[PDB]
Amino acid sequence: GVGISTGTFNNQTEFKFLENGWVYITANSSRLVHLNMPESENYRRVVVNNLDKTAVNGNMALDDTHAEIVTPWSLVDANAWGVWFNPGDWQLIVNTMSELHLVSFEQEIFNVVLKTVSESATQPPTKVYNNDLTASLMVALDSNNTMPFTPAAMRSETLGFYPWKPTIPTPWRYYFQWDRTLIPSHTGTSGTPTNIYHGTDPDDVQFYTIENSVPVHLLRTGDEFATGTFFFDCKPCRLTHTWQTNRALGLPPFLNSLPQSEGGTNFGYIGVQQDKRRGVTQMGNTNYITEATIMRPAEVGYSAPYYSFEASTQGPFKTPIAAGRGGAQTDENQAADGDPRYAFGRQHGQKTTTTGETPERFTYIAHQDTGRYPEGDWIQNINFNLPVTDDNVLLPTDPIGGKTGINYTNIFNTYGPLTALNNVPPVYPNGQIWDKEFDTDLKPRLHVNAPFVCQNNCPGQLFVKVAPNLTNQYDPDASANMSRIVTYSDFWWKGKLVFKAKLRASHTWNPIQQMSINVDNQFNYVPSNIGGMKIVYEKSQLAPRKLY
Amino acid sequence: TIENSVPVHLLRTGDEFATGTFFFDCKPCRLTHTWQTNRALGLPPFLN
Numbered sequence: 001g002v003g004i005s006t007g008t009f010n011n012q013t014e015f016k017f018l019e020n021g022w023v024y025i026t027a028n029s030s031r032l033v034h035l036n037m038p039e040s041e042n043y044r045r046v047v048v049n050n051l052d053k054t055a056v057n058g059n060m061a062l063d064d065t066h067a068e069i070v071t072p073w074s075l076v077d078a079n080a081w082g083v084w085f086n087p088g089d090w091q092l093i094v095n096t097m098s099e100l101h102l103v104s105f106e107q108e109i110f111n112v113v114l115k116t117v118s119e120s121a122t123q124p125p126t127k128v129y130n131n132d133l134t135a136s137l138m139v140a141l142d143s144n145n146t147m148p149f150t151p152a153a154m155r156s157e158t159l160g161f162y163p164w165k166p167t168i169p170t171p172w173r174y175y176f177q178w179d180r181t182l183i184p185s186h187t188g189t190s191g192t193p194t195n196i197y198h199g200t201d202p203d204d205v206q207f208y209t210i211e212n213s214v215p216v217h218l219l220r221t222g223d224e225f226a227t228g229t230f231f232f233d234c235k236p237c238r239l240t241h242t243w244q245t246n247r248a249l250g251l252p253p254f255l256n257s258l259p260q261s262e263g264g265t266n267f268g269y270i271g272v273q274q275d276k277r278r279g280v281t282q283m284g285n286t287n288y289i290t291e292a293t294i295m296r297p298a299e300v301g302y303s304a305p306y307y308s309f310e311a312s313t314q315g316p317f318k319t320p321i322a323a324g325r326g327g328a329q330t331d332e333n334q335a336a337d338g339d340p341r342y343a344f345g346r347q348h349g350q351k352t353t354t355t356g357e358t359p360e361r362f363t364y365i366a367h368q369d370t371g372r373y374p375e376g377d378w379i380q381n382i383n384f385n386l387p388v389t390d391d392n393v394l395l396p397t398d399p400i401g402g403k404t405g406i407n408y409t410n411i412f413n414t415y416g417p418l419t420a421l422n423n424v425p426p427v428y429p430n431g432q433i434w435d436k437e438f439d440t441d442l443k444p445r446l447h448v449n450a451p452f453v454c455q456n457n458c459p460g461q462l463f464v465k466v467a468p469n470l471t472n473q474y475d476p477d478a479s480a481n482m483s484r485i486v487t488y489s490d491f492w493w494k495g496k497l498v499f500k501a502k503l504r505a506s507h508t509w510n511p512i513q514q515m516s517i518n519v520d521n522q523f524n525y526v527p528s529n530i531g532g533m534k535i536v537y538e539k540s541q542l543a544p545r546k547l548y
Numbered sequence: 549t550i551e552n553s554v555p556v557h558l559l560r561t562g563d564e565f566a567t568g569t570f571f572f573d574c575k576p577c578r579l580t581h582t583w584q585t586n587r588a589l590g591l592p593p594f595l596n
């Protein structure tokens with residue numbers, strides 16, 4: 001009832017160790033949540049159109065043009081690592097365990113409070129807040145995944161990463177169909193390249209409402225709402241990186257000449273003429289057998305177009321890349337490897353004391369050496385007459401289609417039935433955790449935003465909304481504004497995400513990469529003179545594996 | 549040659565030839581189209 005709590009705060013992370021090194025990580029999470037009434041109690045179809053920026057020519061990539069259905073609902077998304085682990089937890093996981101399964105997920109809403117502002121009372125004149133005991137908070141759980149999946153992790157719009165700091169949902173909203181053409185161009189191009197928004201393909205219209213699709217629960221102060229326990233089924237995500245590229249697969253060539261003093265240029269030598277060597281290559285012509293020529297069982301990684309943009313009905317979009325890392329010592333083609341870049345604000349990692357609207361950012365460079373360094377690519381002529389003539393080789397230097405800044409690698413693609421890959425490593429703390437699978441008849445071998453993908457069915461989305469708190473003035477037949485009592489709600493959210501992981505083991509003489517602090521580093525894990533605080537980007541697949 | 553590979557039945561007026569019932573198993577073919585391209589996947593950006 002009124003003065004009786006309906007739940008328990010728990011942001012505790014339990015590690016229950018079992019036999020044969022299986023661990024049972026139960027991450028509990030709780031937050032205090034704030035939510036105001038909708039700007040209007042209506043659904044809206046809104047179109048965004050920036051000809052302002054696209055008409056510029058050479059500015060195609062700055063397209064934002066789209067259509068959208070505005071909901072009076074807010075979305076409680078907790079799909080991001082920061083909601084479930086602090087750095088310490090993350091340290092433990094990443095340093096000691098070899099893989100990670102996603103087991104179960106449950107959540108509840110409790111200790112609901114609804115208060116009305118209203119208002120004016122009196123002289124300066126000040127504001128005053130009262131409890132509306134009889135008021136209701138609307139909660140709806142889409143357990144059928146009836147409605148479009150809109151993971152908030154892409155927009156850094158999940159719940160807060162701090163337990164002792166309150167948080168908010170985000171106004172929910174989803175994509176509505178629109179036709180759209182935009183032809184590319186450059187600064188030099190004159191005339192106006194066609195740049196139009198055609199409208200809406202009626203065959204593709206889907207207008208969704210919570211009200212017609214999901215049962216809605218009314219919660220008063222004394223009520224509570226809990227979902228069941230959802231059980232996952234997905235592959236494991238591994239917490240080790242692989243380091244071998246093709247150049248280190250299999251048996252290294254026998255050295256007939258070993259060095260006889262230590263030092264920095266005391267190399268060893270194969271000691272056989274490159275054309276009198278034994279072994280296997282896929283070059284029918286030469287008898288040359290070199291490390292760049294010798295057969296390898298397959299191909300680690302693949303080359304992709306960059307910055308490639310492709311277009312269909314609704315406009316242009318970047319072509320996504322799987323692999324990475326590809327560069328050697330501190331130099332990687334952060335576009336060729338499609339290395340991701342995360343932008344976020346205070347609630348999700350940036351220093352909470354920082355003023356100004358400019359977000360904090362970082363670019364995740366994986367540890368797994370499976371990407372490409374397109375500067376180092378090339379193509380020789382069939383004849384392999386070498387040292388190779390300029391006419392018989394195509395370099396990443398030689399311009400294509402008469403453009404100075406373009407070479408073949410920009411349109412190159414060596415994906416194929418010998419391509420080998422790893423899945424994306426988890427990005428702590430801003431990374432998504434799980435993602436729904438596409439409802440296409442054929443599916444992607446992975447996703448780039450999350451390591452766990454539900455081909456099963458994913459947990460349903462949770463939607464909240466403050467109940468219409470009407471005044472005595474109400475005429476629905478009238479076009480005039482809905483006059484509503486200004487109302488808002490505070491509620492507590494508790495979630496439990498259960499993982500099952502497996503402990504790693506030492507197989508080498510040498511020790512390995514692991515997190516720690518560090519006389520550097522040390523100050524990102526504590527608050528400040530004021531109320532702190534900061535959460536920092538921090539890798540995941542620290543320990544080496546073994547491809548072959 | 550048909551002849552060396554398949555049993556051949558000779559049918560006169562009063563004869564008939566019937567096959568068994570063959571049972572398939574393949575994945576389902578869907579009678580719905582998908583409309584979303586990359587430009588429409590997930591959470592649209594918040595409008596201020």
Ligand SMILES: [Mg+2]
Nearest residue numbers: 243325367369
């Ligand atoms: Mg490396």
